[PDB]
């Protein structure tokens, strides 16, 4: 299970036993001999002929033997007394302290170096060139940031950093060991019935290995223990097997198990996973894999000191960058004026289009006023308006999270570029004065007029359409009301609402609510996409005080406030205050784009703060990371919660770094997500050094495929390969691609590369199939070798989200009792269309299965050869055994598949493993995003079981539509579709948080809306079952009832 390439041992019974930034500007990968101009401190260039791969140690060394031959020598002193400097790619003069870097690894721009003595004495604080290399933009580029919000985020966040660095060093060394090597642990300790059941009433055989002296010598101790006994107990009874001699009294045996006992801790054989705290043994994901797969766990007895040896200190430093009370917003006595002045740089065919006019609105997720335009005046050629816009909404009634949203349009109506501006700045001031906003180009999806789903801020581009605005002036700067000055408003409203007698819509001591209006626990239960009616909104608003009882109703209630009504909003604040904390699977909608208010989102965090575990968090990390775009300012409560988690658990730290860095190139977030990374990298301790090295390889790997794809394709694989190899022999590469942690799962060390096992795959996109040796001493016992694929040219983000949506479905079913076995192989987007794809060993494409066997005269596929091939690889009950898996997984990758409406499952994106497990690869585009052109209704069946697959499901005989094994199946599918249907909210909420991404199959809630048809949410389960069966019955051309 990423542990064993998901490989079931079937006989095993437990009972019966910057881009284009090659090495040099333009160049790519730099030529093998290269001349370097070395500018001296005596003002003389001397040109060294240097090998591509030489270290600045050899170069410094050669240069000062060679100046010896140019005029003015005595005017220089010993090398020892100088450092190399040059202009890098990112155009910043880098001092080169590490003098062991290679001439090819520096990213130089032009091939020249300069000699200086290094002033800046804190040679220490300039190790943070690291921090810059780790993020791919250089820290000093932040000290160049004028804007005061960013420069404030940089200082304020340091709180969190010292919090983490503190909360770690708490019970050193154990607490720092708990930091680096956090127990990998399933969520329920309660096992599920079908798993417990492979255990002869709950007992695992486990093999503990031990190291005494050489020690290239080993010792097995096969314990058989209660399934739920904490690592300590296991180490206890382990050392018991070890010692018991004929010369040891029983009493003095027990004594020795007391002393020795806890000087050791349990490590997983073959990777850097340790079992460092109490958990029932079956809770660690490893054991519970090993059980699932018919495996004997192998643990290794670890000297606890020898571990505390392997980590040393992270050693934090606080970094180098270490008008009165204003006027209450609620005093401003007028509507909102907004003046659109001119616009600069629209590019259109003056003949091809009628006119253009600026379209604006004020929004809060969905607007609070009568949206408005502005006369179609000066079209096209140099376009000015001087209009003020009269928005009907009083200024005291603007929400905190309220926002101007504009766009330039063409008439015939059509949007050209859009922009959204935050009507309040972070310190709480109501925007005034000039703003030159900088618009975004309208995307794929949206063929609407405005864009409130979009991001708030100016697009950074000298060459985009700049539109220039003026917000009203109020002779004092204006701040949004104090958190108290609102709780005084509520109390008023409430004492006011208690003294009327006519009734209207908000037709609200003791209220008449009795029973019948238990339509409230009804609304409650409906999913998010499913809209709230007018009445329902008023209805809810009118029983707001009741809702507290059904607290998970909030996500609706909120939508029911009129957000342009301080009275309503001022009260909705006081409820949020003492609203019951709620379960994460539903506090997480509160962070999607429909809830932009700070108090709301603050609560959503307080909820997480409370419930979400360190494991549920790594399960939903993307959703969390991604959702950040919808936070209004830089320093917000979510950012702060996440960061603290990142710095407390280095395995969340890992995937927090990458997820952020993946989008590093994406203009909408580059700013936000750089600063946050500068934060992580400064406080995560030693790990930063480990990340530099992953980062160091992924670059060499980018710049290698980048040469293969451009000028180098057209030559036969054979030629291309004997280049790829030529190139990884390079010293600089062997070095950079060999001693690091797998970015796919950092517990997996990558040792020496093994080239004969490396190769370019067949795909157009030239993937690199790479293979590393496991340099664990117990390599053997897990996987001696270790391979991953590196693909450059596919937005992986999608494959990644599906694979995350498969992993969730699985846990759901299983972690409930219901055993379908999906194999969501691992996948990591590490850049702009550059990702790592995990390799399932022993899989095959249906195509090959059919191609490995089946007659001579190549005259047409034998529909039985899948079965056959399996029935070769598995004789025995090892047969009955492999079919159950094939049946159990086939049913899974079917429901999931129908639900997420992924790409067609034609005959070579379905794979079969030797133990009989089938799974998908290459999910095209999910959510049937090929109804973009047509797809009206369809609700297509992507996986459709041909005769082929059916034969295998019904062990053999003809007429498979009608056996029992088939019913068994069917009855699996029903159970599995209905199970997902019970959790739909989570699944919508999941895709909802994704809208934030640049993924073009996720543009707007209507994109998500598919799921709500697939899952038949508008109906009763009873009906859904039938809709589902029918749907199967139909692509399957009949026979799917009784």
């Amino acid at each position: 299970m990423s542990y064993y390439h998901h490989h079931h041992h079937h006989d095993y019974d437990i009972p019966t036993t910057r881009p284009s930034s090659g090495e040099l500007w333009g160049i790519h990968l730099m030529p093998p001999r290269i001349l370097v101009e070395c500018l001296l401190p005596n003002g003389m260039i001397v040109t060294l002929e240097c090998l591509r791969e030489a270290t600045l140690i050899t170069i410094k060394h050669e240069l000062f033997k060679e100046a010896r031959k140019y005029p003015l020598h005595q005017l220089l002193q010993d090398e020892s007394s100088y450092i190399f400097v040059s202009v890098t790619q990112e155009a910043e003069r880098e001092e080169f302290f590490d003098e062991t870097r290679r001439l090819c690894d520096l990213r130089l721009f032009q091939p020249f170096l300069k000699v200086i003595e290094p002033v800046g004495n804190r040679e220490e604080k300039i190790l943070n060139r690291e921090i810059g290399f780790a993020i791919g933009m250089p820290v000093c580029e932040f000290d160049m940031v004028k804007d005061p919000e960013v420069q404030d985020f940089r200082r304020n966040i340091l709180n969190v950093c010292k919090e983490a660095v503190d909360l770690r060093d708490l019970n050193s060394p154990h607490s720092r060991a708990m930091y680096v090597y956090p127990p990998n642990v399933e969520s329920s300790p309660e096992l599920p019935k079908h798993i417990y059941n492979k255990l002869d009433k709950g007992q695992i055989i486990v093999v503990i290995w031990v190291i005494v002296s050489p020690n290239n010598d080993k010792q097995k101790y096969t314990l058989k223990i209660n399934h739920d006994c904490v690592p300590e107990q296991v180490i206890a009874e382990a050392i018991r097997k070890k010692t018991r001699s004929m010369l040891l009294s029983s009493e003095q045996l027990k004594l020795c198990v007391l002393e020795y006992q806890g000087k050791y801790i349990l490590k997983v054989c073959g990777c850097d996973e340790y079992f460092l705290e109490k958990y029932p043994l079956s809770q660690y994901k490893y054991i519970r894999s090993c059980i699932m797969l018919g495996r004997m766990p192998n643990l290794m007895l670890m000297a606890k000191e020898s571990l505390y040896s392997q980590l040393p200190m992270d050693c934090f430093t606080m970094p180098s960058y270490s008008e009165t009370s204003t006027k209450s917003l609620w005093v401003i006595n007028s509507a909102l004026r907004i003046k659109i002045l001119c616009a600069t740089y629209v590019n259109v065919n003056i003949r091809d289009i009628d006119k253009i006019y600026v379209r604006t609105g004020i929004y809060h997720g969905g607007e609070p006023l009568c949206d408005n335009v502005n006369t179609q005046r000066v079209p096209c050629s140099n376009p000015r308006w001087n209009e003020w816009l009269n928005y009907d909404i009083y200024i005291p009634d603007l929400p905190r999270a309220a926002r101007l949203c504009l766009s330039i349009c063409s008439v015939e109506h059509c949007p050209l570029a859009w922009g959204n501006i935050n009507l309040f700045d972070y310190t709480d001031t109501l925007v005034s004065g000039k703003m030159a906003l900088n618009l975004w180009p309208v995307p794929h999806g949206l063929e609407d007029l405005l864009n409130p789903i979009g991001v708030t801020g100016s697009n950074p581009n000298k060459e985009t359409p700049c539109l220039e605005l003026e917000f009203d002036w109020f002779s004092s700067v204006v701040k949004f009301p104090d958190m108290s000055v609102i709780e005084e408003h509520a109390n008023w409203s409430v004492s006011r609402e208690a003294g009327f007698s006519y009734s209207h819509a908000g037709l609200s001591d003791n209220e008449l609510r009795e029973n019948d209006k238990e339509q409230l626990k009804a609304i409650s239960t409906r999913d998010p996409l499913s809209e709230i009616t007018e009445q329902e909104k008023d209805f809810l608003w009118s029983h707001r005080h009741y809702c507290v009882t059904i607290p998970e109703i909030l996500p609706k209630l909120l939508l029911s406030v009129k957000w342009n009504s301080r009275d309503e909003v001022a009260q909705m604040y006081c409820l949020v205050k003492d609203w019951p904390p709620i379960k994460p699977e539903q506090a997480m909608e509160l962070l999607d784009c429909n809830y932009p208010d700070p108090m709301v989102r603050g609560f959503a965090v307080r909820c997480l703060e409370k419930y979400l575990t360190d494991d549920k968090l790594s399960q939903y990390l993307i959703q969390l990371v991604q959702v950040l775009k919808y936070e209004q300012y830089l320093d917000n409560l979510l950012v702060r919660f996440l960061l603290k988690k990142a710095l407390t658990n280095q395995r969340i730290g890992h995937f927090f770094f990458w997820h952020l860095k993946s989008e590093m190139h994406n203009k909408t977030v580059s700013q936000r997500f750089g600063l946050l990374l500068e934060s992580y990298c400064r406080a995560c301790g030693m790990y930063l050094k480990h990340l530099n090295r992953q980062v160091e390889a992924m670059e060499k790997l980018i710049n290698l495929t980048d040469i293969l794809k451009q000028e180098k394709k057209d030559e036969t694989q054979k030629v291309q390969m004997k280049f790829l190899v030529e190139q990884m022999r390079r010293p600089d590469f062997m070095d950079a691609l060999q001693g690091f942690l797998s970015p796919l799962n950092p517990a997996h060390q990558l040792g020496n590369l093994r080239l004969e096992e490396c190769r370019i795959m067949s795909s157009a996109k030239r993937p690199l199939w790479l293979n590393w040796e496991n340099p664990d001493i117990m390599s053997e016992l897990l996987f001696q070798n270790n391979e991953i694929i590196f693909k450059n040219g596919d937005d992986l983000r999608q494959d990644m989200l599906t694979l995350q949506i498969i992993r969730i479905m699985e846990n759901i079913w299983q972690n409930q009792g219901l055993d379908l076995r999906m194999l969501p192989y691992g996948c990591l987007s590490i850049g702009d269309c550059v990702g790592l794809i995990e390799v399932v060993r022993n899989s095959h494409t249906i195509m090959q299965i059919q191609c490995k066997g089946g007659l001579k005269g190549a005259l047409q596929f034998n529909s039985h050869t899948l079965h056959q091939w399996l029935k070769d690889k598995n004789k025995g009950e090892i047969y009955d055994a492999a079919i159950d898996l094939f049946t159990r997984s086939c049913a899974g990758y079917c429901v999931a598949t129908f639900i997420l409406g992924i790409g067609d499952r034609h005959n070579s994106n379905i794979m079969v493993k030797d133990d009989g497990q089938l799974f998908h690869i290459d999910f095209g585009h999910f959510l049937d995003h090929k109804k973009k052109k047509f797809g009206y209704k369809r609700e297509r069946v992507p996986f459709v079981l041909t005769q082929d697959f059916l034969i295998v499901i019904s062990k053999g005989a003809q007429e498979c539509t009608k056996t029992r094994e088939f019913e068994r199946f069917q009855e699996m599918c029903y159970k599995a579709y209905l199970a997902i249907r019970q959790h739909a909210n989570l699944f919508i909420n999941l895709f909802s948080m994704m809208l934030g991404s640049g993924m073009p199959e996720l543009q707007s809630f209507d994109d998500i809306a598919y799921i709500r048809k697939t899952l038949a949410l508008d109906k009763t389960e009873q009906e859904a079952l039938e809709y589902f069966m029918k749907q199967m019955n139909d692509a399957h051309h009949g026979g799917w009832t009784t």
């Binding site: 003002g43 003389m44 607007e367 581009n461 009616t533 009129k562």
Partner: protein, 241 residues
């Protein structure tokens, strides 16, 4: 009157409705479990209303509609359903209307293909432009360094030439290897710039033909959901797509 009703699109659940409400403006109306109730009005962002309240003098589904097609200011703080008669070029074949569908649908497909070709070139060109902006400055920095150098060359040179004869020569030499090289680099930074502003140009020619070929890709789009709709009002629609 209720079946025909013009805006009573029938069974069309929440999603057929919303994807027939996307892109019409204000004024737009149209009517749609029984643990919930009966029919829904869906105006326009989307406003669902379930008489609506106590003053139900009914008298019909339709007697309700023409007082609020005459409105809804007075209970809470435009048919757009026009029976696909308008255009759909009155081609009354059930099949000429159908094959036509395909004819605009390949055309829509054709444009999305030229469109996305363009969306990506822009995004590429943007990034080549910025990469050309911090090159232009990686050049400017390079020269700053060389200037700084070749001056410190003269600071120390005209300070060791109180001299005797050899040296004199072979100092001026490398000093003059240096100032040609300064020119040589400068040769490069105008050149890059001339390609920069060459690209800065053709960048516009993309935003031009994007916002030139967006008008189409909504109209051509629109009339399709117009034609496509006259089929499902009377009549498998897979083949023409």
């Amino acid at each position: 009157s209720l079946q025909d009703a013009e805006w009573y699109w029938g069974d069309i659940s929440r999603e057929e409705v919303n994807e027939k409400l996307r892109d019409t403006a204000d004024g737009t109306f149209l009517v749609r479990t029984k643990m919930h109730g009966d029919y829904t009005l869906t105006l326009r962002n989307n406003k669902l209303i379930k008489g609506f309240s106590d003053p139900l003098t009914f008298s019909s589904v339709v007697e309700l509609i023409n007082h609020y097609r005459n409105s809804l200011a007075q209970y809470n703080p435009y048919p757009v359903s026009k029976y696909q008669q308008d255009q759909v070029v009155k081609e009354d074949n059930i099949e000429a209307v159908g094959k036509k569908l395909h004819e605009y649908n390949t055309q829509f497909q054709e444009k999305s293909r030229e469109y996305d070709r363009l969306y990506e070139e822009y995004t590429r060109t943007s990034q080549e432009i910025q990469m050309k902006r911090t090159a232009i400055e990686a050049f400017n920095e390079t020269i700053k360094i060389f200037e700084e150098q070749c001056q410190t060359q003269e600071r120390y040179s005209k300070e060791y030439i109180e001299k005797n004869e050899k040296e004199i020569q072979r100092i001026m030499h490398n000093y003059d290897k240096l100032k040609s090289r300064i020119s040589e680099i400068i040769d490069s930074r105008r050149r890059l710039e001339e390609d920069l502003k060459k690209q800065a140009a053709e960048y516009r020619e993309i935003d031009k033909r994007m916002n030139s070929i967006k008008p189409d890709l909504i109209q051509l789009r629109k009339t399709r959901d117009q034609y496509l709709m006259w089929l499902t009002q009377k009549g498998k629609l897979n083949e023409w797509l």
